[PDB]
Write an enzyme that holds these catalytic residues in place. Structure first.
Site, PDB file in Angstrom:
ATOM      1  N   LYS E 137      75.498  41.747  64.655  1.00  0.00           N
ATOM      2  CA  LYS E 137      74.315  41.608  65.484  1.00  0.00           C
ATOM      3  C   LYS E 137      74.595  42.144  66.879  1.00  0.00           C
ATOM      4  O   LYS E 137      75.452  41.596  67.581  1.00  0.00           O
ATOM      5  CB  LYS E 137      73.887  40.154  65.563  1.00  0.00           C
ATOM      6  N   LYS E 160      77.309  44.792  57.696  1.00  0.00           N
ATOM      7  CA  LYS E 160      76.062  45.520  57.519  1.00  0.00           C
ATOM      8  C   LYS E 160      75.574  46.096  58.840  1.00  0.00           C
ATOM      9  O   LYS E 160      75.763  45.508  59.906  1.00  0.00           O
ATOM     10  CB  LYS E 160      74.986  44.613  56.926  1.00  0.00           C
ATOM     11  N   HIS E 253      68.723  48.938  50.027  1.00  0.00           N
ATOM     12  CA  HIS E 253      68.066  47.993  50.915  1.00  0.00           C
ATOM     13  C   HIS E 253      66.571  48.146  50.723  1.00  0.00           C
ATOM     14  O   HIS E 253      66.046  49.248  50.890  1.00  0.00           O
ATOM     15  CB  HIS E 253      68.447  48.246  52.364  1.00  0.00           C
ATOM     16  N   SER E 333      70.037  38.023  50.811  1.00  0.00           N
ATOM     17  CA  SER E 333      69.529  38.696  52.003  1.00  0.00           C
ATOM     18  C   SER E 333      69.464  37.697  53.152  1.00  0.00           C
ATOM     19  O   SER E 333      68.408  37.172  53.508  1.00  0.00           O
ATOM     20  CB  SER E 333      68.169  39.320  51.727  1.00  0.00           C
TER      21      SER E 333
END
Lengths: 126, 287, 154, 150, 411, 414, 149
Positions: E137, E160, E253, E333
């Site tokens: 993040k 990710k 995705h 997810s």
């Protein structure tokens, strides 16, 4: 393992009809199962001598109907097919004389193949 | 290039065979500098054909960066006759792994220059421009193209550096420095920017000072060009000692600016002169 | 190898090797132990060697250095330690990139940005005006402007 | 303004918790709201309940958090048309209003309180009631329920 | 059309629709028209109709198709032919494709998933446990790179990249790739287990996509991300071919599924998307979370096992064979906490890519990881995770105060 | 978030959502939630909220995104960044994006239509009238010779285009190169023996991008003026690649929805078609199917968005932001589906002179063809003479013509 | 036949109207035979409508068995039976029963019959062993008081 005269083959299986004759002193199911398992090697990946039949002809001549799991064969070749089927099974010694008579390809293994280039109709039109 | 806070420091070479070239540039690198610069007109003349020079400078950079830990480079030159041969030399510079490359945008034309910049983007090598003709079309006050337009369009096409030049008018120079490095400039006749040239988050280009200067003018430059800049420039001891002297002098000036010592007022006294390898500085500084 | 021939300087009673132990867990106040790293590479270390051992990107190392520098320059200048405390509670963006040369400019910009609390490029936001003095070598409009308060000099 | 949660079609598939309120109507009037049983005694296992007074009409409401919070003093008022009661816009549909008589005192300026209007029953903002110096109300509206539709 | 007396030839293609007619059109005519809108024998025969279980004015239709009528080895052609403009039928209130049965013969034609469950699992040597990963993040390159280093060395397996972050004025894919390759190399060197970062290879063109994939190879990355639905199935299949050619793990995705299947009156239920995706190509696949969980678990078991039996309850319709075409890996997810760690392991089996704090990043990483362990371990020893969850995490059991430091954070 | 006392910088991106929340959700909260979960100074801004005109619980939300969130010229990036996950929401009962306000910046970066209307309208030597194109009703089972025969027939009658069907791209009963070669021989023989430049759409919606390029390469080498491609089913990536290729080589590019009905079918969800139309005018295409007209307002709206260069907001017809285009060429709309000749006066008025018509046959193909190739003059002649069409069309169409041309009997059928 | 605590929002799949007329065990079959079978939520007000008035009204949240019942819905209070007062008394009970499914067909399924005093729940197999092919109601769920701990 051996000659299994109830393995009515699933559609997706591949089939092969051999025509052979055994060395002296060997019964039928023995030679049949030998033929099958030889081209093999879980036991899911082995052929099965699903049928044996004496040639309704002269003598000492037998059709062996064998199945084959689809997974053994490639996705697009006939070369892998030939190597699998007639690779070394003729090199066997317990067979007085062997001859591969006919093959059956399930439609699963035919859709992928590229077939002929143009076939009958397109070529006549051209 | 893992270099923060401080500006970057550039050596020039006084003049040669290719072996001499390598030993000399390795000296002036290991001494503690960031970049070295080929001369203004050394590309392919029958002393140092590109292949031998490139090979040797690359070996020297490798050896020096290794035996000093930090990361360094040389402004290899690729201003080539045709275009595809320029690309040949660029590919070759990439194979060895040099991170920076020179060019001469005017004397080689904006077309090939843009091609080189686009190729750089893909190959990740910091392109470093060098004016080399500007004086033919700017210096006359009442005629020509004022340099700031060239700067604007150059940042518009390609280049991670630009030889803005020395500073000691200066108002115009500082102005267009702000015009290329920032990303939004208000119109200011005095500073010399006429239109509120926006820049839409396009990256900046380090302005570079060059020539006609020496370590004695270190503070003012650091004071004028701030931090994000490429300051660049024999020594009574040799290349390596004067090199390390430049490095430590700039370092002390940075320390003092951060310390809030007024550079413009104290510039003559801030110098080390004792302690931090002033021996290697030699305090030569004769006028 | 391991030369570092360039510039080398030539909690006050720590050891030499395990100094970085004060930095993995950072058990000290934020902006006092930056001169500790200064003295650490005074023996001839470099931030490239310190990254993979301590966990401080070189940007943050120089950030801490200049922040300790500013906290020192302001500690010996003005009362109201809250200003310095306004730094000790993190938030160094308000102090970076000291272009303001002298100390009076330093304290002026410091207290002003504390007053207005504009991080995220606010430091340069004020600096670009404060260093642009309201005379610009005798322009028109130096008679009704201040020069030490950014509120009346912006 | 007024919290409005609308009951929807197909919501009968799996309600894990549900609550019961007596029903009063616009035609029935203020008297019915006073008459309705306030304390519903929960001797419940998965819901078993008894009421202090016998009541003819009951609405079964899902355990929406505002409705669940009320507990005692919970009532539902049926309105033929939404527009008359709602100070704001309406879509010409029957309205169900959930009111808590416990908080009937007007203390919330933005809070909506059911009151006896000359025409019938209306929901009024607390500040407006304070302007008229009305210290008490029938009930304090907690939720407005809107009918399932296509 | 509408011959409700028909045995589907086991090598035909089958489709299971759910629709609602208009006030006056009978359901049988509706199914007839639906099957007909695909087009002699080249006509879809509406072999069955029935009403749905309980609802009003809504029916299931069961259609058959000749398999040959379709392209030898595409997904986009399948979609064009099967769902082209049947929805545009003005004489239908609404409908939603609920499932597709692919005959074994058609399944043979595709490359399938590039690597698959077992091949992948071997390439990373990570056995007998799910594969954990967090989303980094947020910035420029160096900060992002050192951040990946922190949040990766802390025992996380996968990191990710944010979906909307592919290439920008302030973030150039070249730089992201360079720095992350550096960080991964360093971390894998330090720890030893093959680490992995997704890399969003999504491109305005196709040549651009291939160029980026080539770069991501040259660096030495094992795995790369690629949206599929917004970037379309053509690019996706091409990327799958290239992944098989270059030995890279391909990670998908959804990134637009919520525009298609969120409601149940139009769209295509995510089952058909999952099947089609497995057909074209893809190793990992986002499949939401679990907190209808039956439908999710259903089509998860669909896209993974090689032989799925019909189950209306779970949410499947046809016994769909696979011919040992490999499986893919579902992905939790995000949207979960360490507290939800055990229940996940309860349902998503050993083969699943799970995704996700004070005290900085890497402590959160190792906390999450040690939470993953000792849960899979516990179940290996034999427990009921659903009943013991709080106890399996009684404290920093045999661990330093970091996972414990984050457990009390549940308030 | 939600700072409604604010204005968007004239080079920001804007989006017009129409949504409906769950019970007990304040509209402003929902709008700010949209803006947030859709994306410092890079946050979105829910800079406007209002309720729908007349209808219940359903608000318009104008959200302004900053430019720097977007790849320089990537439709797929724009989409996967805006409508990535916002639909995957809990408090939002329903959500439907209905407009985008692409600014001047990030518009001059797209390749755009590969030829635009003016250029190709010059290429295909046709003017004034709108282009005419019929499809091939014998969809499937057709032999290769039969295909060449039928298409030459349907051309020589005086048609401009022979729309290959959609679901046919390559089969075990029909192979691309075979049909390509044959339809090409046919179009050549027709063009040579009638004196006009005619073209036949060809489908190249290939499985994998490589095969798409290969079939396009062939379609060029053989000599072709146009090819067909279906974007939603092949994805904007492949589409942009094909558009770039078509700008490289002198070929037009025809698009065709073949999926849209799944995305826009109801008035509370999905993406309204005008957003797809805008994005498709950006990425690449010349011709684009746009339904029919027998709701016309929205149709004229997203026609103008595909055919003009400056539009104002005009919330009536269905546009929400004045959208400029910086001379990026406009694309050609395609009126297609269930079209008897009885509509000739209607279409030629609705879609103006500049569009293309598709037609999904009294006694053959050439007769029906040449029949159809009337009132593309006759009715057009009437209009250019001054004639009510939307309310006088039946008069001119062979009731003022009375012509031995087979369209007499063809018209008397209906 | 699940046993569920009255607990709020365990499963998140919806929220709506369901009602059952309540009987006491002490009342016996007569009360069950008289409770209103058809309880119809409608209009738009959604106030429930019963074919006949009933004294006691309880609702059972629309869990799947409750939703399945429809007609014949009934709720039965059951009260315990402690040998020792100090030993904790068993909780009060309620039985959701489908009177429409009166016939005894499932051995596993419990059915509502009449005890000597009050009512009782008996296994279907036991009822068939006793030769009763009929019961008052079929139990579809079991009770448990709202527990917050």
């Amino acid at each position: 393992t051996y000659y299994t005269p109830d393995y009515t083959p699933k559609d997706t299986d591949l089939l092969a009809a051999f025509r052979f004759s055994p060395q002296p002193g060997v019964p039928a199911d023995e030679a049949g199962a030998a033929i099958a398992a030889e081209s093999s090697t879980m036991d899911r990946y082995k052929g099965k001598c699903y049928h044996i039949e004496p040639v309704q002809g002269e003598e000492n001549s037998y059709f062996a109907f064998i199945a084959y799991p689809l997974d053994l064969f490639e996705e697009g070749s006939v070369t892998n097919i030939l190597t699998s089927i007639v690779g070394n099974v003729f090199g066997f010694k317990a067979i007085r004389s062997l001859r591969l008579e006919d093959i059956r390809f399930p439609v699963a293994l035919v859709k992928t193949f590229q077939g002929p280039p143009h076939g009958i109709q397109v070529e006549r039109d051209l | 290039l893992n270099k923060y806070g401080r500006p970057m420091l550039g050596c020039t070479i006084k003049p040669l065979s290719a072996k001499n070239y390598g030993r000399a540039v390795y000296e002036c690198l290991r001494g503690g500098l960031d970049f070295t610069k080929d001369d203004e007109n050394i590309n392919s003349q029958p002393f140092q054909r590109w292949r031998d020079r490139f090979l040797f400078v690359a070996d020297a950079i490798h050896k020096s960066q290794a035996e000093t830990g930090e990361i360094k480079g040389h402004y290899l030159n690729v201003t080539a006759p045709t275009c595809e041969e320029m690309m040949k030399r660029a590919e070759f510079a990439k194979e060895l792994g040099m991170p920076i490359i020179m060019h001469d945008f005017l004397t080689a034309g904006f077309t090939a220059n843009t091609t080189l910049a686009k190729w750089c983007r893909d190959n990740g090598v910091l392109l470093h421009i060098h004016r080399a003709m500007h004086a033919v079309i700017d210096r006359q006050r009442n005629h020509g193209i004022h340099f700031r337009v060239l700067a604007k369009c150059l940042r518009l096409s390609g280049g991670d550096h630009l030889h803005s030049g020395t500073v000691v008018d200066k108002a115009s120079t500082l102005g267009f420095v702000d015009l290329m490095r920032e990303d939004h400039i208000e119109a200011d006749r005095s500073r010399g920017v006429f239109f509120t040239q926006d820049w839409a988050s396009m990256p900046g280009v380090l302005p570079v000072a060059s020539g006609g200067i020496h370590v004695w003018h270190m503070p003012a430059l650091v004071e004028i060009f701030g931090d994000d800049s490429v300051l660049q420039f024999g020594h009574p001891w040799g290349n390596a000692p004067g090199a390390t002297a430049n490095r430590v002098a700039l370092e002390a000036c940075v320390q003092a600016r951060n310390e809030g010592r007024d550079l413009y007022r104290e510039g003559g006294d801030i110098l080390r002169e004792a302690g931090k390898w002033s021996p290697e500085l030699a305090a030569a500084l004769d006028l | 190898q391991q030369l570092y021939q360039p510039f080398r300087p030539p909690f006050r009673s720590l050891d030499s090797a395990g100094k970085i132990e004060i930095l993995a867990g950072r058990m000290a106040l934020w902006f006092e132990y930056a001169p500790l790293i200064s003295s650490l590479y005074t023996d001839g270390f470099t931030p490239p060697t310190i990254e993979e051992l301590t966990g401080i990107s070189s940007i943050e190392q120089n950030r801490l250095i200049v922040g300790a520098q500013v906290r020192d320059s302001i500690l010996q200048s003005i009362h109201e330690p809250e200003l310095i405390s306004a730094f000790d509670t993190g938030g160094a963006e308000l102090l970076y990139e000291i272009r303001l040369l002298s100390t009076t400019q330093r304290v002026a910009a410091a207290t002003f940005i504390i007053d207005r609390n504009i991080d995220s490029k606010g430091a340069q936001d004020l600096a670009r005006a404060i260093k642009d003095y309201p005379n610009r070598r005798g322009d028109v409009g130096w008679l009704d402007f201040d020069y030490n308060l950014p509120g009346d000099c912006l | 303004r007024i919290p409005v949660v609308r009951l929807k079609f197909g919501e009968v598939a799996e309600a894990t918790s549900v609550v019961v309120l007596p029903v009063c109507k616009a035609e029935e009037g203020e008297k019915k709201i006073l008459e309705a049983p306030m304390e519903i005694i929960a001797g419940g296992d998965f819901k078993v309940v008894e009421a202090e007074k016998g009541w003819k009409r009951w609405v079964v409401l899902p355990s929406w958090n505002p409705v669940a919070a009320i507990g005692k003093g919970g009532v539902a008022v049926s309105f033929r048309d939404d527009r008359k009661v709602l100070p704001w816009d309406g879509k010409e549909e029957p309205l169900l209003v959930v009111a808590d008589r416990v908080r009937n005192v007007v203390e919330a300026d933005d809070g909506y309180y059911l009151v006896v209007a000359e025409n019938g029953l209306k929901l009024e903002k607390g500040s407006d009631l304070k302007a008229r110096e009305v210290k008490e109300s029938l009930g304090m509206v907690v939720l407005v329920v809107r009918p399932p539709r296509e | 059309y509408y011959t409700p007396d028909y045995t589907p030839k086991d090598t035909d293609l089958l489709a299971a629709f759910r629709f609602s007619p208009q006030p006056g059109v009978p359901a049988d005519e509706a199914g007839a028209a639906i099957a007909a809108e695909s087009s002699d024998r080249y006509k879809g025969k509406c072999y069955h109709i029935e009403p749905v279980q309980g609802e009003e004015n809504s029916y299931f239709a069961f259609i058959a198709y000749p398999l040959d009528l379709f392209e030898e080895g595409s997904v986009t052609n399948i979609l064009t032919s099967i769902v082209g403009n049947v929805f545009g039928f003005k004489a239908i209130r609404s409908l939603r494709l609920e499932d597709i049965r692919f005959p074994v013969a058609l399944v043979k034609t595709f490359q399938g998933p590039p690597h698959g469950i077992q091949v992948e699992r071997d390439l990373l040597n990570k056995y007998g446990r799910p594969m954990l990963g967090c989303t980094i993040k947020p910035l420029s390159a160096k900060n992002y790179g050192r951040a990946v280093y922190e949040c990766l060395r802390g025992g996380l397996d996968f990191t990710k990249d944010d979906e909307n972050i592919n290439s920008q004025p302030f973030q150039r894919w070249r730089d992201r790739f360079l720095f992350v390759a550096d960080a991964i190399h360093k971390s894998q060197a330090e720890t030893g287990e093959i680490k992995g970062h997704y890399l969003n290879v999504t491109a305005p063109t196709c040549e651009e996509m291939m160029k980026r994939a080539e770069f991501a190879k040259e660096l030495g990355m094992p795995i790369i991300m690629h949206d599929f639905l917004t970037a379309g199935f053509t690019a996706n299949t091409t990327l799958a071919k290239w992944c098989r050619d270059n030995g890279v793990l391909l990670h998908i995705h959804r990134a637009m599924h919520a525009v298609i299947d969120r409601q149940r009156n139009h769209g295509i239920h995510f089952r058909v998307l999952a099947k089609c995706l497995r057909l074209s190509g893809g190793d990992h696949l986002h499949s939401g979370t679990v907190v209808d969980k039956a439908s999710t678990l259903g089509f998860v078991d669909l896209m993974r096992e090689d032989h799925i039996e019909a189950d209306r309850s779970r949410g499947v319709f046809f016994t769909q064979d696979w011919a040992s075409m490999p499986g893919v890996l579902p992905v939790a997810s995000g949207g979960i906490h360490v507290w939800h760690m055990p229940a996940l392991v309860e349902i998503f089996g050993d083969d699943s890519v799970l995704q996700f704090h004070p005290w900085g990043n890497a402590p959160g990483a190792t906390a999450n990881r040690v939470a993953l362990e000792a849960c899979v371990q516990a179940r290996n020893e034999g427990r009921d995770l659903y009943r013991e969850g709080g106890d399996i995490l009684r404290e920093a059991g045999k661990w330093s105060p970091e996972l414990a430091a984050a457990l009390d954070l549940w308030k």
